Amino acid sequence: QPVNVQWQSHQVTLEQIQHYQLTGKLGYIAPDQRQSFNFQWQKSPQKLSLRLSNFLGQTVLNLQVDEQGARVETYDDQIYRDQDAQSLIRNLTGLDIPVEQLEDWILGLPTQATHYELNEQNTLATLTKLASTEEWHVEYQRYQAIEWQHQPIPLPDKLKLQQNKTSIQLVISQWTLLP
């Protein structure tokens, strides 16, 4: 089996995309709760902001991740801090969102220690990741070509994540790639 040069080159380009915004819908289904959220995801080097709001626009949760750790402002404006964003969100809301892994998956990058399959366009089709006893199955349902430094690059615009009984369906509205 030869190295897939197109896939490896795509990875290097994705690794350049360090400052960006992303908006869309996040559909959450689990045995304990079902939710339909607007999401606003803002990424910069070593930093992440994620706002979830309800279908009427009111804030459900605001997450900030930086070098100090994770900070969540909850729906009722209580403030909580801890070291791991996924664990903190789960303890405060019951929602299981693999925030750390999504920093790679949302762009179409794999994490380390993962299995995956490519599509015929040499980008991710499906991926599996065993993380903290959760076996995540990720499906890249659709890509959209987005301009990056004057070149069209495929980025996910429909992505589904599932582990156990929990599924997260992301549907993208707008990628905004920043200098």
Numbering used by the authors: 33 to 211
How is this structure described in the published paper?
In Gram-negative bacteria, N-terminal lipidation is a signal for protein trafficking from the inner membrane (IM) to the outer membrane (OM). The IM complex LolCDE extracts lipoproteins from the membrane and moves them to the chaperone LolA. The LolA-lipoprotein complex crosses the periplasm after which the lipoprotein is anchored to the OM. In γ-proteobacteria anchoring is assisted by the receptor LolB, while a corresponding protein has not been identified in other phyla.
The mature but non-acylated form of LolB from V. cholerae (LolB-VC), was overexpressed in E. coli, purified and crystallized. Diffraction data were collected, and the LolB-VC structure was determined using molecular replacement. The model was refined to 1.46 Å resolution. The fold of LolB-VC is similar to LolA, with a large curved β-sheet consisting of eleven β-strands that folds into a hydrophobic cavity filled with two short helices. In contrast to LolA, LolB-VC does not have the long-extended segment running on the convex side of the sheet nor a 12th β-strand. Furthermore, the helical segment that fills the hydrophobic cavity of LolB-VC is slightly longer, approximatively 30 aa, leaving 11 Å3 of the cleft accessible in this crystal structure. A Dali search using the LolB-VC structure unsurprisingly identified LolB from E. coli (LolB-EC) as the closest structural relative with a Z-score of 26 and an r.m.s.d of 1.4 Å with 31% sequence identity of 172 aligned residues. For LolB-EC it has been shown that a leucine (Leu68) is important for its function to accept lipoprotein from LolA and target them to the membrane, Indeed, LolB-VC exhibits a leucine (Leu63) in the same position, an indication of a conserved function. Further, the main structural difference is that strands β9 and β10 each are two residues longer in LolB-VC. We used isothermal titration calorimetry (ITC) to investigate if the recombinant proteins LolA-VC and LolB-VC can interact without the presence of lipoprotein as has been reported for E. coli. The measurements showed that the two proteins indeed interact, with a dissociation constant (Kd) measured to 30.2 µM.
